[PDB]
Amino acid sequence: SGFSTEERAAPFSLEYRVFLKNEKGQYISPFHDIPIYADKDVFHMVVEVPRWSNAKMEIATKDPLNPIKQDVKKGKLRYVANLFPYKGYIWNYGAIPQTWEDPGHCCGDNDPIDVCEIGSKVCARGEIIGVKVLGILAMIDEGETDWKVIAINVDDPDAANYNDINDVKRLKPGYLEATVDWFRRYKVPDGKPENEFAFNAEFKDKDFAIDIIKSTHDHWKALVTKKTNGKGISCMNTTLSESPFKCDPDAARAIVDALPPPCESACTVPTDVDKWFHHQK
Amino acid sequence: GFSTEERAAPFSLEYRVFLKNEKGQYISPFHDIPIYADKDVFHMVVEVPRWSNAKMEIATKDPLNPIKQDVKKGKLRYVANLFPYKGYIWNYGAIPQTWEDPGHNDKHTGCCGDNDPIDVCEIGSKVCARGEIIGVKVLGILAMIDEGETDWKVIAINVDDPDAANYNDINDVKRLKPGYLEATVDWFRRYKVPDGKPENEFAFNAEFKDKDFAIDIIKSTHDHWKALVTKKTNGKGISCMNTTLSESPFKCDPDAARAIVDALPPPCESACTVPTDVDKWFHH
């Protein structure tokens, strides 16, 4: 185990918020307060969306304590289209904490580095896991570059057999190809055009991914130590001791409890979240 | 319209779903639902909702033919997730009052019958509930060869689906839902490969015959079913007990249906756990 969750309000409502708590029950920012490494050569990944889900959940980069909230497009909650034949998110999508794609130094998502866990277990939202990195894919998302790290849950029974991109090409054939297809097309059902890829849409190996993750971690270091412009990101955190933005545990308590309490009945998700979507090809 | 009486805990070994008509009297989904819902619209009993993994189906040999979970080798059986699909990529079910009479072969295949009602794949957007009764417009048929038997897979669409009007034959599917039929053929070809049995091949070279051919097959199976439910052909255990068919020897009064249902563990409030192995993929 390691971490726990504090949900606030009903899932899929506008005030639904997922906050992360350490072992001691103290609130923490998933974007700042979770050490990038779980053990040597194992990264923490905060899981934003479970595999085969449709809600677009993500770490609120600009809200205090960086809770996981549901993306909003024009006052209406965002869901991801079911791209035929896939059901929504075909991996556990999430972010590696303590990493920042600096929009300066576009070439910048200004979000944590986005991660695709490809193991068999479908993880829960807000669940913190360890992953061994396996590769990276360089997507250009509407004029900004958002890196997609390919990794696997270190506790998956076969995590030993996977150690670089070719093991994915080998033991789960077509997984990378469908990854590329999904990232290329996920914005087309809104009319908006396809997405491009650097390196001619090929997957770069593990060491290249780790170099990029280290780069984003240095960007994050500079960010959370006041050394580079905070550029709109809420940096409030409860653990970083060498940071100006550290705050007392009860500051986090007050920021959470000032929100609607956790709910019991679950909202009914619209029936359009079940429509397919095809392409002619 | 119709209602459901789920009995025992969902996904346990003794879980059974019975169907009730407008008045709460129980009926068999295999005998008592008219094949036609309206003119040229077929009733479909939904056995498994889209993107589910349990293999549920009408118990052809239990009394009143409830929907129960297939059991293969002492363990309740679920369907493996064929990459890139999540389980059933369509509302899978059966057309009632139809029987794939075994021993009787095919002018268009050679082999004999599923010994089930004719199997149906509904392709609308709405993901239907288990035991829910729907109306469908038939649109085509596929002929799978399963172990020396012909397994007919009818392709249809919910007649109440928001765009059900635009669909009237197989080419409308080829046009408005591209890649859907190809993935259908692939899916039926590859399941149970994660359980070792090899792939399945198809008559007509894995092609879909259009609607008139499908309706020929469906009317054929309905005639076989008539023969079954009027004792004209021996069922070999297929339960013909029913509460409405007036031309039937095996019809039984509503308190018989009451007694056969109430003789089961009552409805549940907790839920059994579906394994995380139901979430494992399977590739290539």
Swiss-Prot record, chain A:
The modification Phosphoserine is found at S243. The keyword Ribonucleoprotein does not apply. GO terms for biological process: phosphate-containing compound metabolic process. Its cofactor is Mg(2+). CDD domains: pyrophosphatase. The modification N6-acetyllysine is found at K56, K221. Its EC number is 3.6.1.1. One of its GO terms (molecular function) is inorganic diphosphate phosphatase activity. PROSITE patterns: PPASE (PS00387). It catalyses: diphosphate + H2O = 2 phosphate + H(+). It is found in: Cytoplasm. InterPro entries: Pyrophosphatase, Pyrophosphatase_sf. Keywords: Acetylation, Cytoplasm, Hydrolase, Magnesium, Metal-binding, Phosphoprotein. The modification N-acetylserine is found at S1. Expressed ubiquitously. Mg(2+) 1 binds at D109, D114, D146. GO terms for cellular component: cytoplasm; cytosol; extracellular exosome. Belongs to the PPase family. Homodimer. This is Inorganic pyrophosphatase. The lineage of its organism: Eukaryota, Metazoa, Chordata, Craniata, Vertebrata. The gene is PPA1.
Swiss-Prot record, chain B:
Expressed ubiquitously. The modification N6-acetyllysine is found at K55, K226. Keywords: Acetylation, Cytoplasm, Hydrolase, Magnesium, Metal-binding, Phosphoprotein. The modification Phosphoserine is found at S248. It is found in: Cytoplasm. GO terms for biological process: phosphate-containing compound metabolic process. It catalyses: diphosphate + H2O = 2 phosphate + H(+). Its cofactor is Mg(2+). Mg(2+) 1 binds at D114, D119, D151. PROSITE patterns: PPASE. It is an enzyme of class 3 (hydrolase). GO terms for molecular function: inorganic diphosphate phosphatase activity; magnesium ion binding. InterPro entries: Pyrophosphatase, Pyrophosphatase_sf. Its EC number is 3.6.1.1. It comes from the Eukaryota. Belongs to the PPase family. Homodimer. This is Inorganic pyrophosphatase. The gene is PPA1.
